[PDB]
């Protein structure tokens, strides 16, 4: 029933299946049930599908362990639409961060490849439905993020935007991703409003395999 979003991100209703290291082809249905429990734009969905058309090697590792990566930001909050058997949760591969009793310092962190394989990384950008969350959590109406590399880089400075109820959510987090090669580095800088990596996807390329929608 899962989406690619529900598969890659760590939806608890989706079996993660780290044991599945590589495979022949991808199987979906046309109308996948489980998109993102907290909705949000997922840019370049097409491109990521085509990049994940094939597998030569693929696996999951812990780029930044939840332990010891973020002492100075409280880490453990989740949301209730993202749930497991009627009990709240959040995507396995990622993290929220918020202050230490309303104590947001701002961040600069980075990582480069030692594994010598190619790497796939995800993150997110927070769009609250109201401002009291913004001031309360992060204590800046200002937003400014800068996710940086050699090839790719981009910044983000969003505001509140009152969207309608979708899965009992007006809020949004827009998801943003990239590939990263051996030798190259990523930096994250931010004044909050982030979804950070817990786990990242190590891989080699593949060739020629691909994707199916099917109910057979």
């Amino acid at each position, epitope marked *: 029933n899962c989406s690619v979003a529900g598969w890659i991100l760590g939806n608890p209703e989706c079996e993660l299946l780290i044991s599945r290291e590589s495979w022949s082809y991808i199987v979906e249905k046309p109308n996948p049930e489980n998109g993102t429990c907290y909705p949000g734009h997922f840019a370049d969905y097409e491109e990521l599908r085509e990049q994940l058309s094939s597998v030569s090697s693929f696996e999951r590792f812990e780029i930044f362990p939840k332990e010891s990566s973020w002492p100075n930001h409280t880490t453990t909050g989740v949301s209730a639409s993202c749930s497991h058997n009627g009990e709240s949760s959040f995507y396995k591969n990622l993290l*929220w961060l918020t202050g230490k*009793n309303g104590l947001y310092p701002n961040l600069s962190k980075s990582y480069a490849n030692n594994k010598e394989k190619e790497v796939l990384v995800l993150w997110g950008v927070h769009h609250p439905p109201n401002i009291g969350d913004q001031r309360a959590l992060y204590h800046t109406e200002n937003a400014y993020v800068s996710v940086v590399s050699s090839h790719y880089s981009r910044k983000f400075t969003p505001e509140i935007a009152k969207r309608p109820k979708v899965r009992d959510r007006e809020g949004r987090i827009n998801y943003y991703w990239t590939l990263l090669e051996p030798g190259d580095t990523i930096i994250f800088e931010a004044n909050g409003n982030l979804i950070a990596p817990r786990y990242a996807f190590a891989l080699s390329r593949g060739f020629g395999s691909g994707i199916i929608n099917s109910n057979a």
Partner: single-chain antibody, 236 residues
């Protein structure tokens, strides 16, 4: 989580007077971390103040506090005989453990929850409680069960986040056991191996907006709202 120290556990003062109360801990503990309550004996608690400065809903503007680090403080601008009450000091540990100051009487000189099952058992025995929800989404908030002996400092029995990470005290753990139901909009507390330390009043308590949901709900790191509690006792 850290031991607190209220100052004073009771005081006696006259009308048209301020009142300084100081709740201070072992360590320095960062100050959007406490919340402050009142209670009349016979009534359940009520919320007043949070994070050592700031003020709740449905309010005058008289109780106002300050302080930081190790020493937190709530002051009072004016005293009145309607305020005749015990005020409390409740802090959210980073070890996710609420800790409690032992209540502070002011003497003046001249939507809802519902509990279920409170009563008597034999000591060394077994009994369960439930709570049930009314007029909100029991999905969201981070829940706590609490105890209170009569006219004593409170004790925090237990609480649980919606992601399943538990927190008990090391003495109470194993003897009590919780379970939650959001689809039912209700809560459960099966309990075994019960002794006279459990002879006390209890409360079910709705806490904290986890990260994310639709509403006109802010959050604090304070309570959301209490229940009316109920008595539990062992005897023979």
């Amino acid at each position: 989580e850290i031991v607190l120290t209220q100052s004073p556990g009771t005081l006696s003062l006259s009308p048209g007077e301020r009142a300084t109360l100081s709740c201070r801990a072992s360590q320095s503990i960062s100050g959007y971390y406490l919340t402050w309550y009142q209670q009349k004996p016979g009534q359940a608690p009520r919320l007043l103040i949070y994070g050592a400065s700031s003020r709740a809903t449905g309010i005058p503007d008289r109780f106002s506090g300050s302080g930081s680090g190790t020493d937190f403080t709530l002051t009072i601008s004016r005293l009145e005989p309607e305020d005749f009450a015990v005020y409390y000091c409740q802090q959210y540990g980073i070890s996710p453990v609420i800790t409690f100051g032992g209540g502070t009487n002011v003497e003046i000189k001249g939507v809802q929850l519902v509990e279920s099952g409170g009563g008597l058992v034999q000591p060394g025995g077994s009994l369960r409680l439930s709570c049930a929800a009314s007029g909100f989404t029991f999905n969201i908030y981070d829940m706590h069960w609490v105890r209170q002996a009569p006219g004593k400092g409170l004790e925090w029995v237990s609480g649980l986040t919606t992601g399943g990470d538990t927190s008990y005290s090391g003495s109470v753990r194993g003897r009590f056991s919780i379970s939650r139901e959001n689809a039912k909009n209700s809560l459960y507390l099966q309990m075994n191996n019960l002794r006279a330390g459990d002879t006390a009043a209890y409360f079910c308590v709705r806490g904290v907006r986890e990260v994310g949901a639709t509403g006109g709900d802010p959050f604090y790191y304070a309570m959301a709202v209490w229940g009316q509690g109920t008595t539990v006792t062992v005897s023979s």
